[PDB]
Amino acid sequence: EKRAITSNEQGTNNGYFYSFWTNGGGSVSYNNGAAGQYSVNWKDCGSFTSGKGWATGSARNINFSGSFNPSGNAYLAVYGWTTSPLVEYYIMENYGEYNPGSSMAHKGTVTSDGSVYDIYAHQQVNQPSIVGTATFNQYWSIRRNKRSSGTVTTANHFNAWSRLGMGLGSHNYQIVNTEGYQSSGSASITVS
Amino acid sequence: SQNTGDTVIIWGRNKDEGSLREACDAGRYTTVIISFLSAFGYIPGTYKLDISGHQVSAVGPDIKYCQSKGKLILLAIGGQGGEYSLPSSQAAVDLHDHLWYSYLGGRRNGVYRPFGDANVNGIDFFIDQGAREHYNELAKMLYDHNKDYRATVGVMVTATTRCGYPDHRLDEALATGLFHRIHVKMFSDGRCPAWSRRQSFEKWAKTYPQSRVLIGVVASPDVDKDAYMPPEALNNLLQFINKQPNFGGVMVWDRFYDKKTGFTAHL
């Protein structure tokens, strides 16, 4: 149980695509498990993203379940990237002690998979991303009640975004992302 | 099947292997390693691509097509022969700027990019011959671009090694700790004997716990007779070596014989 991943890696594990990225700050340990399960443990992290999913996103339904115990700022969300337009999208089902909604442009309200999400958009200018330093938008769907298991009909959220001028491009990857930022905690998620 | 990781196929060693779009539609691979980039360094001037004669004009649009299907494309440098090395620390810099602006995410105004606007996802250090010449400085120089990248491995640095540990010609760059993946060849000069394959792979795995270590196998006995393992035998060996925590999958040489034998299909 001492063996773990602590540097950036990307690939497939037990049929599922997986990605772990960190800026190096603090101590973050990631571990792939059976099927589509992963776990992560971090302490005074800088910034990291982690999770299993699909190497090519789509309007698929996403099943997730597990435990998510942060001590600070952390996210649990369906997460992915699209190119042309460059988009980084979140479908947040759970988070720690910080909600980025109050610092983003509230743009609408969608209801899907048992709750109502608040939709936000935000522009990143010359910020790092999956194709280098670039300018892109962040699409957000933030659940009002925080669950640790369920299904995500990504077609619903992708429809309201396109309905509100937030169009996606060619999907890049799509995962259930446990993301931390200047915090500590632990998470164990199964993706299906 | 006992392969819990990636399936990497090596491309560009026989003209009749088909296209690059062909491999990404076979539904059997997760990563393609373009091969090779024969000569560099010895001659400070021209950098020699060698893919045995493939219609180089379509590799670019093919590189972009696979990434749309979740595939990852790697550029392999070196090989067996072709007069490659990095004589001076200056040759690594020129090789770096060649990779960054011609293949990778960098852009100049007067450089030619054989692969168009498509970007190769990383460089594979297929350093079979040569010496210990300045690949560690090239590794650090390529890895540095990852600071512009978020939530991904922007520029992946992998290596293809001898079977016996340590590889005298790659142990320098491997010590950096910057290599994401290591492919352990079972099938070229420095063959492992069958009675020491598992022990040699486990030594490589335990030495680099922060690198995903993959096993390199041939797809047909025509490539290496004393190193070939039928799919059933390879699955038995995987049942032991996949218990390593950093086991990364299998790398198959090559696309040509994987077409003829259907090796990865029976695996």
Author numbering:
A (entry chain C): 6 to 197
B (entry chain B): 6 to 272
How do the authors describe this structure?
The rice xylanase inhibitor protein (OsXIP) is structurally similar to GH18 chitinase and homologous to wheat XIP-type inhibitor (XIP-I), which inhibits both GH10 and GH11 xylanases. Various inhibition and interaction analyses showed that OsXIP competitively inhibits the hydrolytic activity of GH11 xylanase RXyn2, but not the activity of GH10 xylanase RXyn1 from Rhizopus oryzae. Although XIP-type inhibitors share significant sequence similarity with GH18 chitinases and adopt a (β/α)8-barrel fold, they are thought to be devoid of chitinase activity because of lack of the catalytic DxDxE motif, which is completely conserved in the catalytic domains of GH18 chitinases.
The crystal structure of the OsXIP/RXyn2 complex showed that OsXIP, which has a (β/α)8-barrel fold, extrudes the loop between α4 and β5 (Lα4β5OsXIP) and inserts the loop into the xylotriose binding site (−3 to −1 subsite) formed by the inner β-sheet (palm) of RXyn2 jelly roll. In the OsXIP/RXyn2 complex, the cylindrical cavity formed by the palm of RXyn2 was upright and stacked on the loops at the N terminal ends of the β-strands of OsXIP. The Nη2 of Arg155OsXIP made salt bridges with Glu93RXyn2 Oε2 and Glu184RXyn2 Oε2 and hydrogen bonded to the phenolic oxygen of Tyr95RXyn2, which are highly conserved among GH11 enzymes, respectively. Of note, the electron density of a part of Lα4β5OsXIP (Arg155-Val158) was not observed in the free OsXIP structure but were clearly observed in the complex structure. The guanidyl group of Arg155 in Lα4β5OsXIP was shown to be critical for the inhibitory activity by mutational analysis.
